[PDB]
Design a protein around this ligand. Sequence first.
Ligand SMILES: Nc1nc2c(ncn2[C@@H]2O[C@H](COP(=O)(O)OP(=O)(O)O)[C@@H](O)[C@H]2O)c(=O)[nH]1
Ligand SMILES: [Mg+2]
Lengths: 154, 384, 119
Amino acid sequence: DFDSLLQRIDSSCFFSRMGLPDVLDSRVILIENVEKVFVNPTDAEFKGYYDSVEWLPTSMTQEDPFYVLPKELTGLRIRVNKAVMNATKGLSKDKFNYGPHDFSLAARNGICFAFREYVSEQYLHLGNKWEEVVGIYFSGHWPVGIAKDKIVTI
Amino acid sequence: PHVNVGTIGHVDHGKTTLTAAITTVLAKTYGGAARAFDQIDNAPEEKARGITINTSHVEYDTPTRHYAHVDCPGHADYVKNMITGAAQMDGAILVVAATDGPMPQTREHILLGRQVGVPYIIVFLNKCDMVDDEELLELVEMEVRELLSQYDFPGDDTPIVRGSALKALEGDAEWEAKILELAGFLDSYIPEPERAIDKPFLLPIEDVFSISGRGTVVTGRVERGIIKVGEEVEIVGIKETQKSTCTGVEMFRKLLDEGRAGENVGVLLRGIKREEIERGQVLAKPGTIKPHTKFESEVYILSKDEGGRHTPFFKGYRPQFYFRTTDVTGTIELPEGVEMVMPGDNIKMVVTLIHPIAMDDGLRFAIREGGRTVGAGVVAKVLS
Amino acid sequence: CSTLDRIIGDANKVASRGGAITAKQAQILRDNLPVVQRRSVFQNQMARKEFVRDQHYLMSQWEANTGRTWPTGATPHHIIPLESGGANKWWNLMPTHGTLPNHSLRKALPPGTITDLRL
Ligand SMILES: Nc1nc2c(ncn2[C@@H]2O[C@H](COP(=O)(O)OP(=O)(O)O)[C@@H](O)[C@H]2O)c(=O)[nH]1
Ligand SMILES: [Mg+2]
């Protein structure tokens, strides 16, 4: 199953539909760009959820907001990390920058984190929280935040 | 057997603590002199071409090698030393904190590393005493290998030592073996620096005469290699490379079989006339160096305090580029979204000379205005 | 004005008497840390731990590089906050009276955000 995960990661178009108006799930709250999520946010665009939103991890040193890993799992994390890094090279920073800020490293660390924990999630049978998030990454978007049952995404 | 090295990476990642640690652990194990953090951190000022650079020079010895090691307090210092600094690094120790991971000066110091022609980079992953989980160390190693390979360094084959500069310096025998490991990789990974005497012949032309009956002679110092009498030689420079043969080599009236590296000689040629030799031309071993008009560079423009410009320049800037013996004019091309270069800046800069100079990647040069220096650069990529 | 011009200006309004950010300091600040990367809680706890250890050393280096006595009872304040990707270096320090809170020129930016302080 982890082999068909590698294939789907290897054929993905990560961050390719950012700002675009695809269909998407109910929990999703689409926001246009990095500017209007991180720099000049409006409570209207967040649909009243701004005060509850908490950024999904963008650093491997951050804690899991949802939930000793079997060394078998630990390795599956190394291998899916490498593969996610292979699928996220040379990203146009134009779409990840506003004024002095660049979010492409935050995004790359964030997609790597979400897939490592998705692997911990499906291996251990913890639940579907990261599955929700990884599904949005496969749809071509960046899930940046979580507000109650909702997921803020670009 | 002497090798130039030094420590690079972001502020606070442990370059100076590591430099300190290396000196004490090597002095304790193989002999030499321990150097304190204080004396290294509080670096004195160097002044090359009136450019100020805060720089500590340590020496340390492995059983097989002698190291001259540079360490600087600030990014600013490293920018100037890589572009302008006297001793070019034969290899660099990139220090990355396992805590912070790569930061903007981790990426900058690898980028400038490639641009300047630093041939080898080794990695000390520091503060591993503060980061217990190995997966984190493993994922940080993977962040670094991919950052290295992004700028054409062999990330897969890069030696990366997991260590602790502070704990090694404090005397903890556990973390001391990591410093010996690292120094080991200096000895094994960095090849013996390629000596000038063994490189292909090159002599910048500093004067020219026509000797009575004998023909054309060009004077100069031999930068590298050996020119023997009766060898083929090319005149690469301001015009189509000219083919000639060395008929003689005289040093102050005394005839020689060979002109060697470091020596000032007159080089007697065949057929070529006095009027075909030009300012900035070199003698070179045929097909070893080629003429270039356009190239990519990294440049540091001196501040006003360093006796540079008081005002900024624009795309329409048309300065003199002094390579070896003489100035040559050129138009510049700035990188995207940039239309201005202040005093004390450093930018990538695409240059087109109005006529070509023999150059490879890594050649140093100066930007000038009416005699006086206003910048210092290095050829990152020859073109055209 | 750059984001850094705003940071230095705001910091000089709070600087302890005889602890202003001199034009020389501001030049060294810009040259040695133009671009910063936002830190995690863990990473910032690590940078704070190192500062606490070297506080007295860094304060003495501030005194030597600016030629000024450290103001009596002044607290070492980080001009670029450590949590914003600031440095534990004399040139990123400034005497303040009391521990004043820090920020950066709305929710906190996610760790790994790169901020070019010259823009
Ligand atoms: N815990 C720990 N702290 C370290 C280590 N290496 C450096 N440091 C700390 O990092 C801070 C800055 O180190 P320094 O060598 O000045 O970094 P540089 O600016 O790159 O030269 C100081 O507090 C050191 O004590 C290490 O291996 N472990
Ligand atoms: Mg230092």
